[PDB]
Amino acid sequence: GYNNVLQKQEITINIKPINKNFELEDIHNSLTLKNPHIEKLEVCENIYGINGWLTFDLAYINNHKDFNFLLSPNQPILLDIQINDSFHHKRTTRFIAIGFNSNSIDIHENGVKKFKIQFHDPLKALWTKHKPSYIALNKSLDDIFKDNFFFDSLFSLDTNKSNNLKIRIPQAFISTVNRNFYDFFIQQLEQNKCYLKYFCDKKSGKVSYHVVDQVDNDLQRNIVNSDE
Amino acid sequence: PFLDTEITLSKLDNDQNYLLGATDIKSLYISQRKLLFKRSKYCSKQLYENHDNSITYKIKDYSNLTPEYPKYKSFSNFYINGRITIGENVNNDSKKAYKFFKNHKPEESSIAEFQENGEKGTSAILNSKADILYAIEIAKEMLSDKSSDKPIIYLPLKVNINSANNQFIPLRNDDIILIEIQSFTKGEIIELISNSAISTKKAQQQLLQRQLLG
Amino acid sequence: DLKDKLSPYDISCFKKQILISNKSNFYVKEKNICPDVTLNTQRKEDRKISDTLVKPFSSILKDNLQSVEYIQSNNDDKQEIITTGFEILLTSRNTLPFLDTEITLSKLDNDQNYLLGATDIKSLYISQRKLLFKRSKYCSKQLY
Amino acid sequence: EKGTSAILNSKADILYAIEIAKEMLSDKSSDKPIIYLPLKVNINSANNQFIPLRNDDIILIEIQSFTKGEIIELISNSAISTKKAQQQLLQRQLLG
Numbered sequence: 001g002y003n004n005v006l007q008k009q010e011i012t013i014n015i016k017p018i019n020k021n022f023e024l025e026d027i028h029n030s031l032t033l034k035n036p037h038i039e040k041l042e043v044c045e046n047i048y049g050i051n052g053w054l055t056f057d058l059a060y061i062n063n064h065k066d067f068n069f070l071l072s073p074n075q076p077i078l079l080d081i082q083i084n085d086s087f088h089h090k091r092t093t094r095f096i097a098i099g100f101n102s103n104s105i106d107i108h109e110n111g112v113k114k115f116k117i118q119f120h121d122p123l124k125a126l127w128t129k130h131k132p133s134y135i136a137l138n139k140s141l142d143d144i145f146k147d148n149f150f151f152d153s154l155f156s157l158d159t160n161k162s163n164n165l166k167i168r169i170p171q172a173f174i175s176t177v178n179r180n181f182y183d184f185f186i187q188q189l190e191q192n193k194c195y196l197k198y199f200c201d202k203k204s205g206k207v208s209y210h211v212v213d214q215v216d217n218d219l220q221r222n223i224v225n226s227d228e
Numbered sequence: 229p230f231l232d233t234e235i236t237l238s239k240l241d242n243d244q245n246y247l248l249g250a251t252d253i254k255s256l257y258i259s260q261r262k263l264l265f266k267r268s269k270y271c272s273k274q275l276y277e278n279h280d281n282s283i284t285y286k287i288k289d290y291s292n293l294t295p296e297y298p299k300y301k302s303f304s305n306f307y308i309n310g311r312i313t314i315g316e317n318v319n320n321d322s323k324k325a326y327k328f329f330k331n332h333k334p335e336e337s338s339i340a341e342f343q344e345n346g347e348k349g350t351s352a353i354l355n356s357k358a359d360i361l362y363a364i365e366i367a368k369e370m371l372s373d374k375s376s377d378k379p380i381i382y383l384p385l386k387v388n389i390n391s392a393n394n395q396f397i398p399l400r401n402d403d404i405i406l407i408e409i410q411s412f413t414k415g416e417i418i419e420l421i422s423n424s425a426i427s428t429k430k431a432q433q434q435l436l437q438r439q440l441l442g
Numbered sequence: 443d444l445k446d447k448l449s450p451y452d453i454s455c456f457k458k459q460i461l462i463s464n465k466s467n468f469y470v471k472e473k474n475i476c477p478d479v480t481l482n483t484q485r486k487e488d489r490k491i492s493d494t495l496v497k498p499f500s501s502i503l504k505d506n507l508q509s510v511e512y513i514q515s516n517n518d519d520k521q522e523i524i525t526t527g528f529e530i531l532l533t534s535r536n537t538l539p540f541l542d543t544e545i546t547l548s549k550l551d552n553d554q555n556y557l558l559g560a561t562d563i564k565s566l567y568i569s570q571r572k573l574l575f576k577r578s579k580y581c582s583k584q585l586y
Numbered sequence: 587e588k589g590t591s592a593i594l595n596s597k598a599d600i601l602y603a604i605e606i607a608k609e610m611l612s613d614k615s616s617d618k619p620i621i622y623l624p625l626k627v628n629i630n631s632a633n634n635q636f637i638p639l640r641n642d643d644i645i646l647i648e649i650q651s652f653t654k655g656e657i658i659e660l661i662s663n664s665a666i667s668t669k670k671a672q673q674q675l676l677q678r679q680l681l682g
Contacts, residue, residue: 074526
C-alpha cells in the first residue's frame, strides 16, 4: 500500500473451459479469484492485441473441480479479467483472452500449487494452431476470412466498413507452408493497409474486432468509454 | 486519474510542457499499455498461512497516425503439378493443339494485339508479355470442400520452354508441368514432366531420334 | 538393496515436484495431401493416432503438403500425430535412497499419490539426471 | 580435344558482348556499358545442337560473386505465331 488517494484495488479472474465444439461449459460455474492468490500478472496492450503472463496459487490435492483445467494441454481457457479501482470516483478496465498451448504445462509444489498461463487475444490464440493451404477462385478477401472463421458462440469480427477487402480476385493462393494462418491474416492485411482494433465491451463482455481503412467518427462512436 | 488511459483513436490536447517532447506539437494519443501487477510481502504472509503496480504508456503524435502490425512470417513456395487443356470436348484431329487466353475467361487470343509497340514491327516478342494465359487443370483436392467449380488456374507464358531463340513450339494440351506459386497471385511454370515420342524398345533393336509435330 | 515404489524415507528428501505436460484430451487434425494429377487414388488422408479417447477439434487443419519432383512420387513416409506425454521434474537435495536412480529401461511400480501426476497411471522410469555439485563456504576456507 | 570438334567442360576465356542498361554505372562514367561473360553453350541447344547466342536477345544474368557473372535464361524470341490459334498452328525454326 502506502499510496494516496487510492482507496481500493480489487481484481478478478473468471475462468471457463472451452469444449470440442468451441462453446462454453460451467465448472460459481468458474474458478474465480479473490483477495489475491495471484503472485504476478503481466499484460501489455496494443491497438490489435494483448499478451503477457499470469501466475496464481491453489490448494489442494486433490479435487475434481481442478482436474480438467490445469492438468491437460490443448484445452482452451477464457480469462475474464476485471480491474476496478476507487479513489472521489471509480474507474474500470477489463480484459478478455484465451490461453492454451500444446506441450507446455508449468506446475510447482513443495499443498500449495503454482500455475503459469499465457495470454493472447482470442483471434490470435485460436488461429495460431490452424494451418490450411488451398486455392480459392472468384472469391474476395472478406469471403475468405469468414470461410475459415468458425466462432460465433465466442465472439464476432466486424468487416462491414472497409470496402477494399470486398474487391473480387480471380485467383487466390492461400499458403501456410512453414507458417501460421494468423500471419496470413496480418500479411495480406498489410498490403491493403488497414487497421485492426481489438475492443472490449465492459458491459458486458463481447469482443468484436474492427477493420476500417481510415480513422473516422464511426470508430470513435464505438470507443465511447463507459465512464464519467 | 482524470485522463483517458484506455485506448481510443482520439485526440488529447497539449498545453503543459511537463513532458520532454517539443513545444511545437499538437494533440497526442495512447497506443499501448504495460501492466506489472505483483504481490507485496504484506498480502503474501497472511494468505500463505491461511499488491504492487507499475504502468507505462506509449504516446505518439496525432499527425503521424499509422496502423501498427506485429511481427509475422513471409511465406515460401509449394509445388503443384497440373495439366493443360483447351476445352472439354476435343476432336481427335485437334487433340494436341494449343489455344491462348485473354483475360481470365475462356476466350481465344493471339500473341498479337498486345505487342507493346516497339514490336509492330515484325513477329518478335521482347520481354515475354503477360495477359496471355494457359488453361491448366489441377487435381481437385486443393480446393475447398464446398467449391462446385472445375479447377482451372490461368498462368502467364514462359515461351522459352519447348524452344530456343528460334523455335516456336508452344505448350500443347495434355502435358504435365511443375508449377511454383512464388507469392500471392504469382505462379510460374518451370519444367516439363511429359513426352509424346519415346522409343518403346530395348535400345538394341532401335535407336530412335525423332520429332513428332503438329 | 535396490528397492522400488518410493519407500517413505525418500519423501524426507525432496524440494520440488515440477510438472511438464500431462496427457491431453484434444488433438488437431493433420490432413495429408499429395498434390498431383495422375495418381488415381485418394489424395487427402488423415494422419493416424496410436491412442483412442481423444477427440479432434472442429474445422481446424494442418495441411502438410508434399513437394513434387520429376520422379513419380512415392508413398508415404507414414509418421503419426505426436500425442503428448508426461514429465515430472523432482529436485532432491541429495542422492535418493532405496530406489534405482540409475538409468535402466525398466519399470517402477506406483501406489503412493505423493506425485502430482494422475491416479490412473501405472509404472514409470527415469530418463535423465542433472547434477549440481558445488563447494560450500566451509570446505573452501581451510583448502584455500 | 585436338582431337575432333567436341568441347569438354565448356571453356572460359570466350566471351559475349552484353549491353546493359546505362543506369547501373556511376554518374560520371563516359563509357558505353558492355560486360563480357563466359559461355554456357547449353542454352539454345542440347548435346547435339549448336545454336549460339546471336545478338539482339534478352537474358537474365546473375552476379553470383565478385567478378563471376552467369547466364541463365532467355527472355526473347524471333519466331511467333501472331494469329489467334484458330487460323494457324505454327511450329517452326527460323535459322541463320
